[PDB]
Design a protein around this ligand. Structure first.
Ligand SMILES: NC(=O)c1ccc[n+]([C@@H]2O[C@H](COP(=O)([O-])OP(=O)(O)OC[C@H]3O[C@@H](n4cnc5c(N)ncnc54)[C@H](O)[C@@H]3O)[C@@H](O)[C@H]2O)c1
Ligand SMILES: NC(=O)c1ccc[n+]([C@@H]2O[C@H](COP(=O)([O-])OP(=O)(O)OC[C@H]3O[C@@H](n4cnc5c(N)ncnc54)[C@H](O)[C@@H]3O)[C@@H](O)[C@H]2O)c1
Ligand SMILES: NC(=O)c1ccc[n+]([C@@H]2O[C@H](COP(=O)([O-])OP(=O)(O)OC[C@H]3O[C@@H](n4cnc5c(N)ncnc54)[C@H](O)[C@@H]3O)[C@@H](O)[C@H]2O)c1
Ligand SMILES: NC(=O)c1ccc[n+]([C@@H]2O[C@H](COP(=O)([O-])OP(=O)(O)OC[C@H]3O[C@@H](n4cnc5c(N)ncnc54)[C@H](O)[C@@H]3O)[C@@H](O)[C@H]2O)c1
Ligand SMILES: C[C@]12CC[C@@H]3c4ccc(O)cc4CC[C@H]3C1CC[C@H]2O
Lengths: 248, 251, 247, 255
């Protein structure tokens, strides 16, 4: 079970991070929603009660994310779980002939900065916080769960920046679990296929073999709970995608 | 929840299949252990209670497999889940220079027949049974879970036959989930690393000294919780999951 | 250069294996085409001249492959390379709901026996032949090249038996290269996408670029590069124009 | 044959990039070495002769890469091949328990910026230059080859930034090949295991000397010329695309 664990969930005001937060608070854990100030984190935290607060922060900022973890530890006393769901996406070709338009450097930089350098910023700063915990009966001090994408394996036309960023998450999964193994922190990544969140904001659903529909955010939340409960899952990437494989 | 579902677990008399049956029965499901007659199957299904029975069958036998699935459908009315855990292992080099010995073809064939063809034999026969189920609210008629190994990806010296059989399992997982998509049967494969079973249990704790964290052999109850997650989560399909403590196997 | 080398190519009377044999003989190597007695192996070997012979053998047969390897080692003096291209395909659903048809166990067993058990049978018995060679200046005594398929990774509807056999090839590539490391035999597998051969001849249209079936001479070119590069080992290479298969 | 093709090779003053230049120019091609100003660039470009020039440039700069490409296009008339070998490595734990030291954010940012954003900078700006060429008999306009690493799959302890940069190169290889398919530009990535280049001084020392033993066969560090031979194979084979090839002796990295 996850009752009594404290989880910091980035991207927690919407979509997969918010559904994760609803499932873990409903199972008895406490959840901090780390999300930008312009989001609706504060209200969603209120709707989930006193065991779920909002920590406004941008994950590309060291000082903000350090302030958000300080808040979580001060309120709830420790951090057991982190879930990285903050992320953005763009759909721009590397070079579009017709328009003779190269993809800009700054649009690639921005997607790398939020998705991959923002996930590594959270990881590096929560790892020292979970390192303070007394190890449980099996030597574990924490679990860190990241969100990649099937775009890390079958990135479509227009997804070079998003793919680069999520393949970076996938490539650092095993070296960060091997770095944190001596202090008992597992590191696992989930790679969702196509899910019903805002991030889509009209024919995507038909491509999915079975179930033949977009994923429900609550199914990502149930895998997150399984990942936190299973003590031997480590250093691995799970696809959650209805058996889809993306075409160009 | 798995309360009420009927699962047939091949390899259910020992190790990972037996720990899966104990967890699923302790959570309210029914379980049929499918394992060879010599095994401890009968005893185990007795110690597990009236919601678990033993169906003697060798998975390389179409007739025996089909008889066990029919027993299950007779006793319990339907089959909702199948978990393939029957398997064998050998440690024989392709060519051993000290000995001057070449791996026999029959010792490769044997591993391939139990591990690979025997999992396909159970899959193909249980798909037609699950296809008799009424689809649930979300279109689902059944879930098939196979057990490969990390050896499908990092086979060590000595594991050509075992690696070939487990890579065959991994390679057929997506085309079988695509074949079954129209009738709502999910197909997922779990690839354990090293586990404390009557396959493993100085030769063994050297192996457990290589696991990053937790630093020890897997406990079969951890494989059984992964199998419960895979039954419960409706969107996991056509994928292979490593369950191994972050180990990568050296030669 | 592959000049001088002796290769045994299973499935060499047709498609990929024959194009590979044309290229390697054209570059000065010797080739032994290992194929079933009913194929056109004798004529194909005759057309390539006296540096190319036919050794009729089914790769599932331990007696037949040992006699064809022995013919190669006697005729040419040694075996430096083995290319596994012998292979068959089927298109059968696991369970077909409209006809209420279960895939038969025999059709799955026959594809695994030719493609997977046959490729291991050639590897296991050519290894000890190559083990007789004096190592070259970098320790090498031989190179073994197997043929899998993109179906090991994106198997389509109807390909459960073929994907199982090609996923078995990929799976065993690294342990046999580990096994053979002490005697200097490299082991590499190619996973082609779709190639214009008698196994095949809108599939073409799905390949990003170039948008067409592959040409068997491009597979032959990638085989020569794997024979020439001393550091490629224990790896599977996709040769597929960037195709990813849909159901 | 590579004869008469024009190749721009980033990181071309040393290691893999230089040995790749040496091989292509030995085989009849022209090569531009794109490397920083403080490297041996200019002297290598001289030793390699009249069909090899140095364009000093940092791959992280739009302006410098655009200028180096323009010089190649002005001086040889076209660009047929691009080879990304510019790269840096670091060995830093995400969080060090003994020393109680966290990996800095700017050290991870610097390796992602050189290795991954610097490789996409060159791709996107060379793509349009290759797109000026007329298509060959088979529809091809150019080939782009990138260098990742087996760290993209088995990153060791200390390699979080390096692995994240290299796994990002692997992750983008297919979407870029798909993006560039209409114009006939293949995109392939090579993931080298451990090679005898000057980069090697990144490992402990009590690590480095031992490396060879881990390599199954041949049981040694890779020779840079072996990397160069695989690059020529990728240039020549018209059907390789969208794929990553390990070149590593069958090694699998332990922690
Ligand atoms: N929905 C899908 O189909 C899908 C598929 C695959 C992967 N993903 C990944 O799932 C994760 C969650 O996305 P989602 O679908 O829930 O979308 P979402 O847009 O609903 O939620 C993303 C949340 O991340 C927050 N966020 C963005 N930038 C941030 C920053 N710099 N700092 C802090 N918060 C920031 C947003 O404000 C938002 O509340 C993302 O990493 C996305 O890439 C989503
Ligand atoms: N234990 C590990 O470290 C480990 C690691 C990876 C994968 N695995 C895989 O896990 C699965 C379960 O193995 P385990 O460790 O529990 O071993 P186990 O020996 O304890 O259990 C295997 C069961 O399979 C049954 N079996 C063997 N051949 C059979 C046949 N033809 N027909 C029916 N039953 C047959 C055996 O009688 C035994 O009861 C196997 O597929 C094995 O390859 C195990
Ligand atoms: N052509 C494609 O699109 C494609 C794609 C991926 C993989 N492949 C694989 O490439 C390989 C080459 O096939 P191809 O396309 O050249 O087909 P092909 O039919 O033209 O040739 C295969 C050769 O194998 C021989 N062979 C079959 N069974 C044999 C047996 N038991 N013993 C000895 N020889 C036997 C056949 O007689 C034939 O001459 C096979 O392994 C195939 O599975 C082909
Ligand atoms: N040597 C190995 O074992 C090894 C293994 C795997 C991958 N790699 C990768 O191989 C590629 C080549 O490395 P190498 O071993 O030749 O190392 P190297 O240090 O000898 O050469 C790399 C070159 O890249 C140049 N470079 C660095 N940053 C640059 C920048 N911002 N702009 C332009 N040039 C820049 C350096 O000046 C150097 O000349 C790198 O991407 C490296 O990560 C090397
Ligand atoms: C950015 C995503 C992949 C690219 C997708 C796309 C890309 C192009 C397009 O026209 C529509 C869509 C809809 C859903 C998008 C996405 C939601 C899931 C995600 O990862």
């Amino acid at each position: 079970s996850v009752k009594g664990l404290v989880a910091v969930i980035t991207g927690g005001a919407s979509g997969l991070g918010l559904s994760t937060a609803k499932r873990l608070v409903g199972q008895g854990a406490t959840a901090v929603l780390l999300d930008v100030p312009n989001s609706e984190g504060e209200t969603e935290a209120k709707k989930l009660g006193g065991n779920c607060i909002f920590a406004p922060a941008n994950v590309t900022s060291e000082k903000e994310v350090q302030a958000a973890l300080t808040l979580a530890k001060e309120k709830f006393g420790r951090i057991d779980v982190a879930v990285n769901c903050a992320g953005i996406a763009v759909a721009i070709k590397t070079y579009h002939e017709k328009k003779n338009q190269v993809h800009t450097l700054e649009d690639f930089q921005r997607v790398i900065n939020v998705n991959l350098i923002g996930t590594f910023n959270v990881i590096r700063l929560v790892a020292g916080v979970m390192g303070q915990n007394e190890p449980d009966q099996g030597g574990q001090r924490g679990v860190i769960i990241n969100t990649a994408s099937v775009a890390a394996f079958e990135g479509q036309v227009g997804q070079a920046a998003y793919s680069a960023s999520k393949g970076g998450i996938v490539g650092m999964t095993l070296p960060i679990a091997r770095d944190l193994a001596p202090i008992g922190i597992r590191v696992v990544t989930i790679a969702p296929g196509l899910f019903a969140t805002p991030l889509l904001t009209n024919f995507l659903a038909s491509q999915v073999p079975f179930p033949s529909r977009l994923g429900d955010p609550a199914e990502y939340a149930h895998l997150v709970q399984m990942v936190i409960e299973n003590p031997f899952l480590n250093g691995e990437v799970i696809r959650l995608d209805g058996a889809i494989r993306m075409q160009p």
